[PDB]
Enzyme design. Sequence first.
Site, PDB file in Angstrom:
ATOM      1  N   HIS A   1      33.324  60.451 -39.922  1.00  0.00           N
ATOM      2  CA  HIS A   1      31.973  60.029 -39.567  1.00  0.00           C
ATOM      3  C   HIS A   1      31.859  58.527 -39.388  1.00  0.00           C
ATOM      4  O   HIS A   1      30.755  58.020 -39.156  1.00  0.00           O
ATOM      5  CB  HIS A   1      30.983  60.517 -40.624  1.00  0.00           C
ATOM      6  CG  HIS A   1      30.937  62.011 -40.727  1.00  0.00           C
ATOM      7  ND1 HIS A   1      30.599  62.813 -39.657  1.00  0.00           N
ATOM      8  CD2 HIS A   1      31.241  62.848 -41.745  1.00  0.00           C
ATOM      9  CE1 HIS A   1      30.675  64.082 -40.020  1.00  0.00           C
ATOM     10  NE2 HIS A   1      31.065  64.131 -41.282  1.00  0.00           N
TER      11      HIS A   1
ATOM     12  N   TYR B   1      25.881  61.273 -45.739  1.00  0.00           N
ATOM     13  CA  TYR B   1      26.783  62.296 -46.253  1.00  0.00           C
ATOM     14  C   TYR B   1      26.973  62.225 -47.759  1.00  0.00           C
ATOM     15  O   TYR B   1      27.321  63.246 -48.366  1.00  0.00           O
ATOM     16  CB  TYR B   1      28.129  62.232 -45.528  1.00  0.00           C
ATOM     17  CG  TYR B   1      28.053  63.033 -44.251  1.00  0.00           C
ATOM     18  CD1 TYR B   1      28.173  64.419 -44.276  1.00  0.00           C
ATOM     19  CD2 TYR B   1      27.818  62.417 -43.030  1.00  0.00           C
ATOM     20  CE1 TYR B   1      28.078  65.162 -43.115  1.00  0.00           C
ATOM     21  CE2 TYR B   1      27.725  63.143 -41.875  1.00  0.00           C
ATOM     22  CZ  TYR B   1      27.855  64.515 -41.913  1.00  0.00           C
ATOM     23  OH  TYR B   1      27.751  65.233 -40.743  1.00  0.00           O
TER      24      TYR B   1
END
Length: 715
Positions: free
Chosen positions: A393, A237
Site C-alpha cells: 500500500h 490499514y
Amino acid sequence: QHPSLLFTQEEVNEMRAGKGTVPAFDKSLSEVLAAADAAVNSPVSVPVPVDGGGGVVHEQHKSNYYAMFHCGVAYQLTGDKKYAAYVGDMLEAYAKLYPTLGFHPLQLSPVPGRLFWQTLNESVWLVHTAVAYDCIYNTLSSKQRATIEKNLFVPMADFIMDGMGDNHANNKTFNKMHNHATWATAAVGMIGFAMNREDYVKKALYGSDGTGKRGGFIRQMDYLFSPDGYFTEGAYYQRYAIWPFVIFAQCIENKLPDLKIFNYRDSILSKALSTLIQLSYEGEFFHINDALLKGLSAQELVYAVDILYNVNPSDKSLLSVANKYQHTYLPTSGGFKVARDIARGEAAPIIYRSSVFRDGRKGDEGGVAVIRSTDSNLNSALTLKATSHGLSHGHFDKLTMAYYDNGNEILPDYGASRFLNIEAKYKGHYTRENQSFAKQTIAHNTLVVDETSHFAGDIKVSSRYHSDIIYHDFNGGHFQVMVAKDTNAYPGIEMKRTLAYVTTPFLQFPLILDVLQANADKEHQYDYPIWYNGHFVSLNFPYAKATNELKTLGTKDGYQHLWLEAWGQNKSRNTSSFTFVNKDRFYTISIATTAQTEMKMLRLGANDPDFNLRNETAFLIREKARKNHTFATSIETHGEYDVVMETSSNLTSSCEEVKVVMDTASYTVVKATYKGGHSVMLCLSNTDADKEKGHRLTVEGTMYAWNGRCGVFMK
Ligand code: NI
C-alpha cells in the site's frame, strides 16, 4: 465456563442487572437486539459456495456470521431461547454442509478457502461464529456439540492452520507476520478456547511449532508494530489491523489472565490505539499511503476503545473519543463502562501532542512526524512523512508534507483511488489510477526530479530503503521544527526538508516555513508541488490561462493525469505568492523565485477514462537545469471572511519577501519579511543534528547565535 470469549457469566449478569441505568448503552444493546430479531424473522440460507467477493452467496455467508454473532449476544443479554435456537439451527446446517466442501470453485486466491473464495473470510467467519457458539454452548446437547465440533469447527480450524490435500499454503499464512495471520490465529485460538482445545490455543499464540520463534499472535505483536505502535502500511490499514488484535487479546485476558497480554511489549496494543488517535485530525486519519475516508468512528475503533479503556479506566481521554466520534458501545462490560463513565461526567479532553512515530519493527527505519498547535484557540497539524516503503500500500512519497487547519485539510495527501463496494467502478478494487496517479510522487507535496517518481516508482527498489527524521524540537518556545532527509529516492541526490511552525508576535496566526534542499552533482529539473484545497484568489505575477483548449503537464509517472490550467513567470519580484481561500480562512504560499522559475496551476483529471479521479488542484514551482537548489516557502494563515455576515479583514498576504540569504555546505539561512518592518530568520546547520551544539553566523552585519540544528529569530 461459557460464555468466556466476549464476556463472562458474571459480566453478563451485571449487564442485565444494569439495564435502564445508562441510556446510551441501552440504545446500543437495542440495536444489537434489532439485528438479531431481523435474523430470527428471516429464513435460514446456507448455500453451496460458488462466487467471490460481492457475490450473493459470499455475502450470504458473511451475513450469516454477523447474524449468529448478534443472536448469541442477544441470547446472553436477554435469555430469550429463540436467539439460541437460531444459532443452533444454523450451526447444524453448516455442519451438514462443510464436510461436502472441497476448495472453493473460484480459481483466484493463492490461499483459497472452502466456505469462501479466500481463507481470510473463513477466518473472520470463524472468529464471529466462535463467539456465537460460546454464547449458546450450554443450550446444546452433547450430541449436537459433538456433531458440530466434529464436522464443522475442527475441520475448519485444521484447514485454516494447515490447508487440505496437497495444498498447504494456509500453513504459511498461519505462521506469517501479516494481518491475515492475525485473523487466522484469532480464529483458531478463539474456537480453541470455546472447545477447550489447548493445542489450537498454543498454535494460535506461538505458531505451528509452539516455539514463538517463527509464527504466532505474540510474535505478531512484536513484528507488526514499531516500538511506538505504528503499523508500517499506514493509519488507514492500522485501523483495520488493530481489530483482530484487540478481539483476541480480550479473549486471552479472560482465559489466561497471567499472560498479562495487555502489558506485553510495554502495552503495545494501547500504544497502537494512542498512535491512531495522534495520527487523526477532526476524527479522520491522516490519509498517508493507500487510504480512504475512515476515522475514529469506525467499528474497529469502537472495539479498540471499549476494550482498552476497560483495561485502564484512568485514561479518561478515551471517553472523549467515544463521546465525540463513536456514539455506540460494545455489548460488553467495557462498552458498558465507557457509556457509564461518560454519563458520570468523567470524560477528559483529547490531548493532541507533537510526536515522532518511528517506523520499522525496531524503530530504526524512518518515521512520521507531526507538529500540533499548542494555542487552545487554534486547531492545526503539520505532518512530515519519512518512512519505509509501506508494503503493498506504500506511496512513492519521501518527505511529503500535509497541513490541516481550522477543521479542514488545507494542503492534502490524496489517499487511494478506489470506490469501495461499487461494482460498476472496477469491481470496487484499487483502480488502475491508484497505481498510475495516487501512488506517484507528483500526487504528493514533495520534490519530483526529472518527471520521475521516487525509486522510479518500483516497489521492490523502494522496499529496500527508508527516509530518516533527522532532527526535531517540539519545545522551542516560539517555534517547533522537524527535519527529514532522504538519499536513495534519487541515487546521487540528497533531499532534506525542514518544517518550522513559528508563533510570531506580528502575524495573525502561526507561520509555517518550509525549506526543501536538493543537492546533486548533475543538472536536473526540480518540481515542487503544493496540492491545495480551496478556491484560487490571486497570484502576484502575470499568468496565461487555458482558454478553449486544455493539455496535460507531462506524459509519465502521474503527470499524464494533470491538466495544465495556467502558467507564468515572475520577472519583476524575487518572491512569488499564491493566495487561496478555504471556508472562512485565507492561505498564502510565498516562495523564493527568480526570473527563470516556472509557475503552473494544475488540475487533476486527464487520462481518466472511467472517471476514477477527483477534481483536485495544485500550485507547482518548476526549476530547470539546477544541480543544487533550495525551495524556501512561507505558508501564511490569515483573514476573517464571513459570507453570512458579509464581513472580511486581513485577506491579503503580509509577506513582502522570501529570500535565501546564505546557502553554503555548512549553513542555509532563509529570511522572510512581512509588512511593518517585521521578519523571521531561519538558520539551519546543514551538517549536524546535535541538540546541544552552539552555532554563530553573520548575516547582513548582524550576528545570529543559537543552540541545536535550527535557530528561529523574529523581529
Ligand atoms: Ni499518498
